[PDB]
Amino acid sequence: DCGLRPLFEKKSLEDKTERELLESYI
Amino acid sequence: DFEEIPEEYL
Amino acid sequence: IVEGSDAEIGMSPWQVMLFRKSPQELLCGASLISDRWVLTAAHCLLYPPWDKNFTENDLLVRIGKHSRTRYERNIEKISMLEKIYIHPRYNWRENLDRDIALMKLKKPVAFSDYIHPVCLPDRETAASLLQAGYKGRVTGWGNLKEGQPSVLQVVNLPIVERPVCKDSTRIRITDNMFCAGYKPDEGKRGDACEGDSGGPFVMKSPFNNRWYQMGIVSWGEGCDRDGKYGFYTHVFRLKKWIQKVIDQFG
Numbered sequence A: 001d002c003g004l005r006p007l008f009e010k011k012s013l014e015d016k017t018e019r020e021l022l023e024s025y026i
Numbered sequence B: 001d002f003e004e005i006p007e008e009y010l
Numbered sequence C: 001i002v003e004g005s006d007a008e009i010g011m012s013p014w015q016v017m018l019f020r021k022s023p024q025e026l027l028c029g030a031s032l033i034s035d036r037w038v039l040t041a042a043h044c045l046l047y048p049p050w051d052k053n054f055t056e057n058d059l060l061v062r063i064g065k066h067s068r069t070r071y072e073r074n075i076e077k078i079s080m081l082e083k084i085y086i087h088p089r090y091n092w093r094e095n096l097d098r099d100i101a102l103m104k105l106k107k108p109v110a111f112s113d114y115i116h117p118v119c120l121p122d123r124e125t126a127a128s129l130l131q132a133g134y135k136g137r138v139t140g141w142g143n144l145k146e147g148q149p150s151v152l153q154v155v156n157l158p159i160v161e162r163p164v165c166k167d168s169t170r171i172r173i174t175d176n177m178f179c180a181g182y183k184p185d186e187g188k189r190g191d192a193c194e195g196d197s198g199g200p201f202v203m204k205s206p207f208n209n210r211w212y213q214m215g216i217v218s219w220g221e222g223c224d225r226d227g228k229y230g231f232y233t234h235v236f237r238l239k240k241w242i243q244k245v246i247d248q249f250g
């Protein structure tokens, strides 16, 4: 169950800056 | 200023 | 952390606090990788130049924290160490090469909304993500400038090419390290700072949506100086050693 956060991914909610990481993986 | 911890931990 | 922001609650459930029994003080950052194992920077335990040599009895591991100093009753779990394992070839004498250690908890910890492990990279996850330009995330309760936050901070930084890394210092860089930070140019800032050591550098896989630990906060010359970068232990490169110990030692 590693790396899946109980308050974000498991509820399909995003943290306020995770998109900047994703948008960089070109 | 670290708030103290419960004795059972030391 | 310099120029970061307060983390949201439950944002880094694997963040651990290395804590000194007396004086009661924060020693370093760390990360939870399973219910009985913690990963940190070897120089957080052993560094002879500063007379540092911690033993299992000297410390405590505090998990599920948000505030740097209150005792978060009903949220945090405070554990004891059973054993400490330091990379047999860690170089404290010259450049902090192989700056990595494992700590095995006295009793397995229970997962909760605030407590959960991070994944460790596989060869192919490392190959697609560890690229110049991609961003990772660092967290910690360290100094705000080259002073102390009340809560965990966060910053996102880009990985930098090897050449740039080497031309920025006089220290000899090895394959066991990577450097991250913006260019003086890029006009965005941020870095790790004293007290952040032993914490995690993480990335979020675009393939399976999971968070992986790519690096450990190791060293830097100042905090957030222009033309300087932060250096991190290369977790994948040391993975064989990690396996080998979790295997052999419970």
Ligand SMILES: *[C@@](O)(C(=O)NC1CCCCC1)[C@H](CCCCN)NC(=O)[C@@H]1CCN2CC[C@@](N)(Cc3ccccc3)C(=O)N12
Binding pocket: C026, C027, C028, C043, C044, C094, C095, C096, C142, C171, C191, C192, C193, C194, C195, C196, C197, C198, C218, C219, C220, C221, C222, C223, C224, C230
């Ligand atoms: C860590 O946060 C750290 O280990 N903090 C300690 C616990 C709290 C009290 C102070 C010590 C730190 C983070 C640096 C971030 C900078 N942007 N790292 C270090 O202090 C490593 C440990 C050895 N030490 C020697 C001086 C260094 N600045 C530079 C250096 C010189 C020679 C070899 C390697 C690195 C350094 O960062 N540093």
Ligand code: NA
Binding pocket: C166, C167, C168, C169, C170, C171
């Ligand atoms: Na150089």
Ligand code: NA
Binding pocket: C181, C182, C191, C224, C225, C226, C227, C228, C229
């Ligand atoms: Na810099």
